[model samples]
Target: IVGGYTCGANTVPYQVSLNSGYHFCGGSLINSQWVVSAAHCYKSGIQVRLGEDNINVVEGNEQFISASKSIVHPSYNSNTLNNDIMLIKLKSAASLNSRVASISLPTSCASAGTQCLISGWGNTKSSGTSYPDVLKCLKAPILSDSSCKSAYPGQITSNMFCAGYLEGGKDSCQGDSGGPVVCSGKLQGIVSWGSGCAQKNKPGVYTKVCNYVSWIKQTIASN
Candidate 1:
């Protein structure tokens, strides 16, 4: 995440790194067997690394679990990037430990002005490749839909919301998609897209998780 600080180890136990050969995107472990991420990050042969603090170092408290299956939101729109959520079924349930566990799904929608925390291993620069070894995090406040629409101009929808600095300082960048945007200890959103990393009048957009709680639950229950 751009303009963010490296978080302490095990602070975000639910954060998982999605990898094929290298770290690609972040995911939230919602349960022992299932993780929530962005549909746009889907790929075959994914490995979910739990209890990861640094991607470049062996942290010991890590689990390299394979993906058994995946379910992208049926209505996900690639053009507009709507309904960007996805659920990944692990090959085996992640054994919950002190440094690895599931986060709670949101029961209510996050209103505008709610402060949230976003963590990821995405690029730290707006124009260059500078992925960090340690996980980064930023504090962002949810913006009103009206303001978000004004920033994106017809791109913002009810299924999505915007957060971060409109003046250009902090954001989730490439490789951060599908990472959790947690508010009050609940998974409220997923990093989906942005105009650029921390650009003026362009806050990061996220898949509104509250809108898909039923879809997430039902998809898991049936599968």
Candidate 2:
């Protein structure tokens, strides 16, 4: 997050960090046992750390649970990053608290220009080598699909949406991928990819969560 601010503890309860030995990607706690993340963050040994605001400290509210299983979208396209979403089932249900809770999925799609909260523990700068210990966030309004296509022609898909400043200066990056993009208190998007961290004419691309609502429901119900 180049132009983001530090988010206080439990301010965003549904946010989480995906880790093995170190934080790799961010995720949103959609339920007690299910987490939503970017399919690109998929790995063999993932530990879902919930109720975490900071990465380095042992904040009393944190819950560390192993991933029981992970289901990447069947239509996920790695090259184009279409349908770049994933679901992770926890080995054990998380204990709900003020510091740990699930976020509701959006019932409707977010409109263009809707300012949303994009939170993560991604790099502070585009050239930075380290990720932040504390959670960071910034307001990035949804961009029009046409503007998005103009920004990255032939790359934007219907399953994907762009959000951020067209002139740059603020956006999510590598370690932020799979994080939450909440709008109107609903999980609207999942941090997917971008041209670079806050570059001109390049904005943060996210997986359109609204488009996958039925898929999410069916997947969770059947599993």
Candidate 3:
């Protein structure tokens, strides 16, 4: 994420790198064999690497698995970016180990003022040319749906939510799309998009996972 600090090892077990030859997007391990990410992040030949903080070098704990297939929400919109969630089915279940785990999905929605965390390898600045070698983590306060809708009047929807600071500074920028937004250890949101890198009053928008728990369950079960 933009304006984030380097994350330590095993601090976020469920977070993974969505990579082809290199990392571009981030995802969360929802269960043993499935990863939840932004629908727009899906691309052919992409895979998920678990249990690693630094993507630049391979570590003993990291596991790389190819995506057998992916299911994007049928109602996903590219132009408006609504329902921007997707699932990646791994070739096999990820082996649970000391450095690898899954994050629980919330049974109900997270409140407007809930404090949350976002971790990823997104840009540190709007004009930055390089991505960090290590994963970065940052705190983002969940924002009111009303205030968020007001920020991007015609764009916000029930399937989406907003987070970040009103004064700017920290945000989910490019390359962070599809990363997890954890609230008290529960999977709550997925980084989707933002106006710029970290513009004032324009908090980053995310896919509200709570609103699609039923859909997520059905998708995972069927896939």
Model 3: residues >4 Å from true position, as ranges? none
Write candidate 1's Cα lDDT for 1-223 as tens digits. Answer: 9999988887899999999999999999999999999999999999999999989899789999999999989999999999999999999999998789899999999999999999999999988889898989999999999989999998988899999988997899998999999999999999999997999999999999999999999999999
What TM-score, over all chains together, does every model reach? 0.98, 0.98, 0.97
Q: Positional deviation of 174 in candidate 1, in angstroms?
A: 0.6
Please state the error at residue 110 of candidate 3 in Å.
Answer: 0.5
Model 2, CA-based lDDT: 0.93
Which candidate would rank higher by TM-score, 1 or 3?
1
Tens-digit per-residue lDDT, 171-199, candidate 3: 98898899999998899999999898788
The candidate maximizing lDDT is 1
Clash tally for model 3: 0
lDDT, model 3, position 58: 71
True lDDT of residue 55, candidate 1? 90
Model 1 alpha-carbon miss at residue 153, Å = 0.6
Q: Per model, how many backbone clashes are there?
A: 0, 0, 0
Better of 1 and 2 by lDDT: 1
List lDDT for all candidates, in order.
Answer: 0.94, 0.93, 0.90
Worst 10 residues of 1 by lDDT: 126-135
